[PDB]
Amino acid sequence: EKTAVVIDLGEAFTKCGFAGETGPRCIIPSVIKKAGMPKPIKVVQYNINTEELYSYLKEFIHILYFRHLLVNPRDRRVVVIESVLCPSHFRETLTRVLFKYFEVPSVLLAPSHLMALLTLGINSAMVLDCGYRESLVLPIYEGIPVLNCWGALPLGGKALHKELETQLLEQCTVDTGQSLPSVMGSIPEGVLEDIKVRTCFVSDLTRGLKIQAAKFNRPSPPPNVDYPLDGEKILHVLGSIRDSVVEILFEQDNEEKSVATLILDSLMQCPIDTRKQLAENLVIIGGTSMLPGFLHRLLAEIRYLVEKPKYKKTLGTKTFRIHTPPAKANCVAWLGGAIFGALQDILGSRSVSKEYYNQTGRIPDWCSL
Amino acid sequence: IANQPVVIDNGSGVIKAGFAGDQIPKYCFPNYVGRPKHVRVMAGALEGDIFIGPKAEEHRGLLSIRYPMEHGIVKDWNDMERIWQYVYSKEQLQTFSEEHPVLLTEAPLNPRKNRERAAEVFFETFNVPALFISMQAVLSLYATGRTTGVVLDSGDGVTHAVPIYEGFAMPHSIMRIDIAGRDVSRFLRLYLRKEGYDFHSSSEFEIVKAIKERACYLSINPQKDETLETEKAQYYLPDGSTIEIGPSRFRAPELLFRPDLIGEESEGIHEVLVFAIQKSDMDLRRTLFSNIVLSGGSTLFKGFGDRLLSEVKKLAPKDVKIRISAPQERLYSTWIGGSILASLDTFKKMWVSKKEYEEDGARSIHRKTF
Amino acid sequence: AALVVDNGSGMCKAGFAGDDAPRAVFPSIVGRPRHQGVMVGMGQKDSYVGDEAQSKRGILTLKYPIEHGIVTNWDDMEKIWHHTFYNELRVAPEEHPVLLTEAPLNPKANREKMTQIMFETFNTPAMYVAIQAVLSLYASGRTTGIVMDSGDGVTHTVPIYEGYALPHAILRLDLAGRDLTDYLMKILTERGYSFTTTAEREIVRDIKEKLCYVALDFEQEMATAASSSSLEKSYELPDGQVITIGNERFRCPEALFQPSFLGMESCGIHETTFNSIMKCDVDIRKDLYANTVLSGGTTMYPGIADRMQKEITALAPSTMKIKIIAPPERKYSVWIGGSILASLSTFQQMWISKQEYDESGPSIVHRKCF
Incomplete structure (x- = not known):
């Protein structure tokens, strides 16, 4: 009858396509290309002028639906996959742009973790979404997301970018156009993403502990490979640096916090009957989880933290299984929204319509009244 | 050995100390231990790394704070021993235990295990001659001067309501919740993620407590405030950057009356006050309603007492004279x-001596408290 | 049909x-x-x-x-x-x-x-x-006999003789399994096993069904609990966590025989049955003593029939032959x-x-x- 639209906005990338198709049609990055502009500006931003955001969202949606969808969304429904705890200011702006400017029939602002759970096809699961800005945890038990049990450290893609920028600046080796360290003050983000995808090798638990021991009073430094760059300035990036950048994601000491500890804190907050099913079904999604050799380092670190005396008195013996999804780790949240929209013309009714928005005021966020 | 006895008022959020026969506690500071983030190579005997009291308040950015107590129950005992040692040391009291x-x-x-372990610390590690543990409700009534009345209290750890009538504390009429100032601060942090201004670190958690203390007000009608659009008031950080708080300032303390927003089932402040009065005997209920006493820091929100009246008027029997009394010094009432x-002079009879503890043990401490 | x-x-x-x-x-x-x-x-x-x-x-x-x-x-x-x-x-x-x-x-x-x-x-x-009680007596087969029925709702007694119920000798009692479950949950909180929410109400109920048993002599059982730790059993939850309690097995269902623990100010199940039999006619007491039937889940504690035999014999005259009918299928009687x-x-x-x-x-x- 009518295949609905699926959107999954974010600061780094944006998964978008049709509901029903196994995986999206395209994934253009969040930034936009403007005429007479030095650098490309990011679309998804927080704490900034309302009318400017509205114009930025219109500009991104306009370049999206022609290239991605090849259709007017005026014919059929939309599924805007907002991550839970995405600012209400930003949701209101999205609601305005979809109804006032474009005039869609319906919209939906559903959470990312519940839809990622629909892909697995199980009702209870602990979920971790390691995106660009934050690494958010949220356990779901029998459909309902357990909200007060949660956690989100500023330790996703953006933290890894900042650490790469710091460590490369400290130890730099650029070719002539050899020596000459710290010539350029900063480096672009698109290049630094390509370095993370290709170079950064994720270490094991025993290797990670050896690196942590070396930092505070050297084993397994290799391997190292150079990275090519434009304008005839190749830089000889090292092997110990990229491993040290990955290590800060799992660094426990002096914060009592990490990607692994965040699941345990979420499990601690959850009730006793819910506890065991969440431990059995531990789902990992998001952008940072696509890194090579990540799921072992997490599961081994999780287990090491359970062996510690502080978590034995509550958790103890637990079968931590990581049931992986059908689609890739970044594109699990989108696939869930595509499942939610395509199949059920019935569950399209619960979402907010154009008729309801004009008279009322806004889509209902999880708040009072 | 009858010297001027010390009054250590415990608490998860704040700890207070001084001397007997004084008007206000001279020594008040928050109950936590601070450790440097970027710790030294050794992970055993640290030096120059412990700050308790005003040093820790001064140097927030350096220290990763952690509270030893949670819901009026100590988790980390070594931290509480260091805090008690700091209270007795020359930096605060300038006297021996x-x-x-x-x-x-x-x-x-x-x-009871924590109460026994508390007594073990005071009797053996410190060499105390006599120790006495007491309730918060009984102390609040001593401070006001009354004998009768309910004592609703709301600290950082526990919210509880104990009805007392002419020096008769009713054990089966006690109500208790794990919903308090710390939890209110945790959900204000959760709501400021929805505003945009995310916080994560333990030193950074104290900014959320400062926002809660300063800019929060309890609405009379929560449905009416939701239908209306908020003004989005401002607040300056210790750094400098301004923060539009928005609807999170009024929705944060709503917690205490509506714990359904948590996702963990609790009675709430208003039900606990009514339930404690209802669980007591029929003839005592009207006297308990007339003498309602407030205490703790989470009773200091704007329009808290006005809301707590309206909830009592909704639940309690009609045509009854309600009276929620509250002193000027609510934090220091205990x-x-x-x-x-x-x-x-009766204080000498109530306490547990060192000799009596060495003979009997934990059983004598459990007998003297009740 | x-x-x-x-x-x-x-x-x-x-x-x-x-x-x-x-x-x-x-x-x-x-x-x-x-x-x-x-x-x-x-x-x-x-x-x-x-x-x-x-x-x-x-x-x-x-x-x-x-x-x-x-x-x-x-x-x-x-x-x-x-x-x-x-x-x-x-x-x-x-x-x-x-x-x-x-x-x-x-x-x-x-x-x-x-x-x-x-x-x-x-x-x-x-x-x-x-x-x-009339059905519980009819399941057992006898026409004559008092029925000490006790479920989670209500404990009660109905004396019947030769197919003639005595409605005025009936004695309903407020004590029941739910009040015992709440009492066990409170004394668990006293030894550092806090259960507040209604999800944990069923876990403590399941603990009550497994571990707890009626004491033959309460003061003797309290003395043995202090001495030895063999009675202290362990129960694992739905979660992998496991907990150990010593005093609370025999102490929980003792509330039936001593309502003063709960704060009810009522007669115990042992003497409530006696008081029911004494309210009947004097000629038909022997048969009510002989046929002291039990029914419901609150009579499924091990050794309850032995405690009822001890207490009813202590209350009644020495010449009487006391006997408790306690079938295997009294839970569904x-x-x-x-x-x-x-x-x-x-x-x-x-x-x-x-x-x-x-x-x-x-x-x-x-x-x-x-």
């Missing part, structure tokens, strides 16, 4: 009562 | 007439979930019932409709009946007659409302309300009696009909009951 008797405070219906209790 | 439905406050039991044991057995609970603005995936039930609420316990607010054998929420009780007939039993209520059970000395309006729901909403062809009552041919003329209800109304049931 050997000289003076001790008056400790605890919330009602706590674990310490003042301890200082008054310590100054009385 | 006829259906028997023992609407217990805890376990709602139901099945067919002329059967050994009931088919439909489940806890009478109606768990409604945590209502937050966030959505839920692939549909779900708005209000769960029975074993479904017990399976998905962690989230749902478990509220029992019957409180002390008294139906508080009638919409909740209507959903449980609906769950009994259509889902569990798989048979319509219009075809089969329906035997029901209430405890004696209940509110008169509750039978009328129970009967109204059966005829108006459910459209039953014929119904009856029996006393639980009320339903078995209803099945035997439904199977008899004499009971076919004792039913209420639709035409009789339309003529009279709800007040006809009081004549038919006793």
Whole structure:
């Protein structure tokens, strides 16, 4: 009858396509290309002028639906996959742009973790979404997301970018156009993403502990490979640096916090009957989880933290299984929204319509009244 | 050995100390231990790394704070021993533990194991001659001067309501919740993620407590405030950057009356006050409604008492004279009562001596408290 | 032909007439979930019932409709009946007659409302309300004998002699399994095992069923608990966590024999049965002493029949021969009696009909009951 639209906005990338198709049609990055502009500006931003955001969202949606969808969304429904705890200011702006400017029939602002759970096809699961800005945890038990049990450290893609920028600046080796360290003050983000995808090798638990021991009073430094760059300035990036950048994601000491500890804190907050099913079904999604050799380092670190005396008195013996999804780790949240929209013309009714928005005021966020 | 006894008013958020027969506690500071983030190579004997009290308040950015107590129940005992040692040390009291008797405070219906381990610390590590543990509700009534009345209290750890009538504390009429100032601060942090201004670190968590203390107000009608659009008031950080708080300032303390927003089932402040009065005998209910006493820091929100009246009017029987009394010094009400209790001549009979503890043990401490 | 439905406050039991044991057995609970603005995936039930609420316990607010054998929420009780007939039993209520059970000395309006729901909403062809003790005695086989019935709702006693119930010698008691479960949950909190939410109410209930037992002598059992740690058993939860308690096994069901622990100011089950027998006629006491029948789940503690024999002999004269009838199937004795009552041919003329209800109304049931 009518295949609905699926959107999954974010600061780094944006998964978008049709509901029903196994995986999206395209994934253009969040930034936009403007005429007479030095650098490309990011679309998804927080704490900034309302009318400017509205114009930025219109500009991104306009370049999206022609290239991605090849259709007017005026014919059929939309599924805007907002991550839970995405600012209400930003949701209101999205609601305005979809109804006032474009005039869609319906919209939906559903959470990312519940839809990622629909892909697995199980009702209870602990979920971790390691995106660009934050690494958010949220356990779901029998459909309902357990909200007060949660956690989100500023330790996703953006933290890894900042650490790469710091460590490369400290130890730099650029070719002539050899020596000459710290010539350029900063480096672009698109290049630094390509370095993370290709170079950064994720270490094991025993290797990670050896690196942590070396930092505070050297084993397994290799391997190292150079990275090519434009304008005839190749830089000889090292092997110990990229491993040290990955290590800060799992660094426990002096914060009592990490990607692994965040699941345990979420499990601690959850009730006793819910506890065991969440431990059995531990789902990992998001952008940072696509890194090579990540799921072992997490599961081994999780287990090491359970062996510690502080978590034995509550958790103890637990079968931590990581049931992986059908689609890739970044594109699990989108696939869930595509499942939610395509199949059920019935569950399209619960979402907010154009008729309801004009008279009322806004889509209902999880708040009072 | 009858020296001027010390009154250590315990608490998860704040800890207070001084001497008997005083007007206000001279030594008040928050109950936590601070450790440097970027720690040294050794992970055993640290040096120059422990800050308790005003040093820790001064140097927030350096220290990763952690509270030893949670819901009026200590988790980390080594931290509480260091805090008690800091209280007795020359940086605060300038007196020995050997000289003076001790008056400790605890919330009602706590674990007995923690009470025994508390006594073990005071008797053996410190060399106390005599120790006495008491309730928060009984002390608040000593400070006001009354004998009758309910004591609703709301600290950082526990919220509980104990009805007392002419020096008769009713054990089966006690109500208790794990919903308090710390939890209110946790959900204000959760809501400021929805505003945009995310916080994560333990030093950074104290900014959320400062926002809660300063800019929060309880609406009379929560449905009416939701239908209306908020003004989005401002607040300056210690750094400098301005923060539009928005609807999170009024929705944060709503928690205490509506714990359904948590996702964990609790009675709430208003139900606990009614339930404590209802669970007591029929003839005592009207006197308990007339003498309602407030205490703790989470009763200091704007329009809190006005809301707490309206909830009592909704639940309680009609045509009954309600009266939620509250002193000027609500945070210090518990310490003042301890200082008054310590100054009385009966205090010598109530306490647990060192010799009596060595003979009997934990059983004598459980007998003397109740 | 006829259906028997023992609407217990805890376990709602139901099945067919002329059967050994009931088919439909489940806890009478109606768990409604945590209502937050966030959505839920692939549909779900708005209000769960029975074993479904017990399976998905962690989230749902478990509220029992019957409180002390008294139906508080009638919409909740209507959903449980609906769950009994259509889902569990798989048979319509219009075809089969329906035997029901209430405890004696209940509110008169509750039978009328129970009967109204059966005829108006459910459209039953014929119904009856029996006393639980009368059925428990009828399951045991004897016509003569007092029945110390004790469930999670209400403990009560009904002395009967040669098929003649003594309605004025009946003594209803407020103490019951739910009050014992709440007492066990409180004394667990005293030794550092805090259970606040209603999801943990079922775990402590399950702990109460397994570990707890009636003491022969309480002061002796308290002395042995202090000395040795062999009595201290361990119970693992649904979660991998495991806990150990020493004093709380024998101390929990002692509340039946000493109501002073709970704060009820009532007679214990041992002397309540005695007081019931003394209220009867003097000539028919010997047979009531001989046939001291027990029934319900609160009489399934190991060694309860031995404690009843000790206490009743201590109360009564030395010449009397005391004897407690304690069968293996005393947990489901009320339903078995209803099945035997439904199977008899004499009971076919004792039913209420639709035409009789339309003529009279709800007040006809009081004549038919006793």
